[PDB]
Subunit: 199 residues, 5 copies
């Protein structure tokens, strides 16, 4: 079995293009609003960012490789999408191992846990209505012609939100948007995390 | 005796050469045993609900690919090597708020039965409300550790004891430990069909 | 299978393509432009201000040109900025190493032009005295090559005005003006100076 | 003359360029401390921050050469990544140690290696009494992380911490600094475990004659 | 052709460091840009400066006529040997602010000028007075004695022409002295450049 897996990895990409486009499914699990800094208007979130895509170049017949259906690999061994927060104020801090799971249908699952500081005015967090902040996520360099974005849900997963956080969540959504600018033909997709929260 | 030193060096260089794994799978699963030694609660931040711990995390597992016959290598029964030279499990704190900081050399002990012992010392900031730390009852917080990417079918996560080792806890810490346990749990996450085991550190502590 | 032939055509283009840097005999022009997104922090105890901006860099190399007809009508591609030469554009009065906020990926076009737009957070030398007033404070930071003179790298801009169309509307600081004039100082030394006037919102 | 020396060194390094010690091939590592500053004592977390230079010396037969075969070269400098180095560690640090000096060692023709990293360390210390005439006392143990005294035999040249470079205008005055060597034995196991413990007694410079 | 000549030069060119019988002279000088912060709770002061370093290697020499008149080039500092110049009383690792690129000239000389931010041991008592505070920090090789690295200055006057005019701290004087210490047992001398700065709020 080990030899079959090693042989699979040895047998097993310049990224997508207009002629070979890719869809990335994105979802957030929001774990904690750690800090809300009203002297700089930065808020700090901890979340898990679920990323999934599929490549034909990663497919294999399991019967040809000892009935292996999936395996774990360094995210450095594979191409990964350049999904970026568009209004961060510090480099994102990676909180989980940089490992992805590849399946024989060519699909890749990668779920980095991250701490993010982003631009957010927390005025109102000390009130019943709370504060509201938003941050857009998408590719930094690819348009909708190379990378399209999808979600499995428009509701952020709050099932792991820390119940004794300094801040409680009033709502958290991850709506996808496809923006067409008047100037260009390409669509520009994003997924926007919108969080309403209070002390 | 200078020659003897030369021969044991040669035998070790040859063993390491001969030995130097793709990770576990449903069909080649791995048991990883975890144990914690809590050394210090450094800081409790009630403005962000983050607590900072220093601990040693004992990890051990066994690989057939790391076994050897000592009689073929000058009766070498174990050796030390950089953790970079070997596969290591992706044991992760599930509720950290900053990347974990490693305090010790990343070096493992490999024994001729293929067992590996790796014990990194770490400083961890994790989600924890310290309300009550200034009382006789104290505060109580938990943090889960487990593989980030391997389900229970690939890595089986065990302990040797339900008790966190406090015998090296810093006696002049700002915080005294009232109790510390490390029980196992099996959890279904929304991403994935398969169950993931963890070891959950539960710590009750108060200002000294 | 068309998708598969485009992948192979791109792999072949990148192999075919993969420059010692400019010289006095082979000089390079780098176009710079700034998009200011946020004034995060102004520290009056140290006279350091913190900016987040996107720095657009463009240049063109003959060694990166290709014929699209020979590579499947491929007119451009994305590639890691480590695969290519990049200019050593530096803030001249930073007080902390610049922090990169965006993937280090450039777009190369068939005519040999390159576009690279790193988002950055920068602390730089700036006295915010007067930021708590209607007139606000004014600060400046120069950007340019660290090691090349004007003989090897000349700098251009496409505009004298900093792009504020993405400036954070609920920042602690509002922008009164932001300009990016080019300045020249045996060899000439060019820079692009970011001058910002700002005040507490 | 310079060129022949440079050639001879390139040839020596190529000729020369160890799996670490074992019970059958133990290594003596000599340790010493030069304490340069107590920077900060934090009574809200019981952490104290030190700057020191940690001298490490050991000797390998595999690094020996005859100076006569290499143009009389008797010493050279090399990246400490180019060689094995011992896994000497503070046993009660609270942050990763920060290395302040270049990671370069000096190798001598008898096979001896000298490596002296300057370091900033945060470690567990209750500074109670630092604002009094008697001062505070902290201690931090240094030793191998994974090797017993039967693999790494830890020694010192002196029990005295070198204070000759202690910063004269530090916020903290040093009352004493020792580096005594200790051995610990477990009934289970035949191996003895050595450490060198840095013990520092210090006070706020304004606490001396404080009234 | 110019590019081919440069790529040939660098391929022809691409040092184990000095020894007693192959000593190297390193010339050092400082451009002081800012005193950012003076922390009287820990007696640490934070400087931003540019550290000019120059040395010469016979193994980096070439004939400009054999290489198309090329007289110098830029190269990553990781491509060449560089001296281990270190502050002797830093309290945090130095932070590099500029690209790590050096200029190599056909005579074998190398010029390398890193911009750095340095926290060092310094009591700022008196900085709030007319007389100011005075602090000093030594710079030199960590691991080489004067038998291997001979340290020199071109001048003892610290370059203040780029000092930030709205710093929280004004410079009363800055001097870089070529200093050494010798232990009577032994022939080796241990040189340094002592940077002495007198400053005030
Ligand atoms: C214990 N970790 C949870 C808290 C969150 C993450 C799970 C995970 C992360 N990265 C890849 C991924 O991928 C898989 C693909 C196929 C089958 C199973 C998992 C799973
Ligand atoms: C959605 N993107 C923003 C938040 C800004 C950053 C854009 C960018 C950065 N680097 C290259 C570049 O290049 C492209 C060329 C053509 C089409 C799209 C982008 C684009
Ligand atoms: C534009 N940056 C300045 C404000 C400060 C630094 C200049 C510099 C840094 N590193 C090498 C060096 O070398 C060269 C040699 C000859 C001509 C030009 C520069 C120059
Ligand atoms: C000028 N440096 C002091 C402030 C501290 C460090 C010295 C040092 C560090 N690493 C090796 C060592 O080794 C050498 C052996 C012989 C002669 C010179 C040094 C010396």
């Amino acid at each position: 079995s080990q030899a079959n897996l090693m042989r699979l990895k040895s047998d097993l990409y310049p990224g997508p293009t207009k002629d070979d486009p890719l869809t990335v499914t994105l979802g957030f699990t929001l774990q904690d609003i750690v800090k809300a800094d009203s002297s700089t208007n930065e808020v700090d979130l901890v979340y898990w960012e679920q990323q999934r895509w599929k490549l034909n170049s990663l497919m294999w017949d399991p019967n040809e490789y000892g009935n292996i259906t999936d395996f774990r690999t360094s995210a450095a061994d594979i191409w990964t999408p350049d999904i970026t927060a568009y209004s961060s104020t510090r480099p994102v801090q990676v909180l989980s191992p940089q490992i992805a799971v590849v399946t024989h249908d060519g699909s890749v699952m990668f779920i980095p846990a991250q701490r993010l500081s982003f631009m957010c005015d927390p005025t109102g967090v000390d009130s019943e209505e709370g504060a509201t902040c938003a941050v857009k996520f998408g590719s930094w360099v690819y348009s909708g012609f190379e990378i399209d974005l999808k979600t499995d849900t428009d509701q952020v997963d709050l099932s792991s939100y820390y119940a004794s956080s300094k801040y409680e969540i009033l709502s958290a959504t991850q709506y996808k948007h496809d923006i067409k600018y008047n100037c260009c033909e390409e669509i520009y997709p994003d997924v926007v995390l919108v969080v309403k929260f209070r002390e």
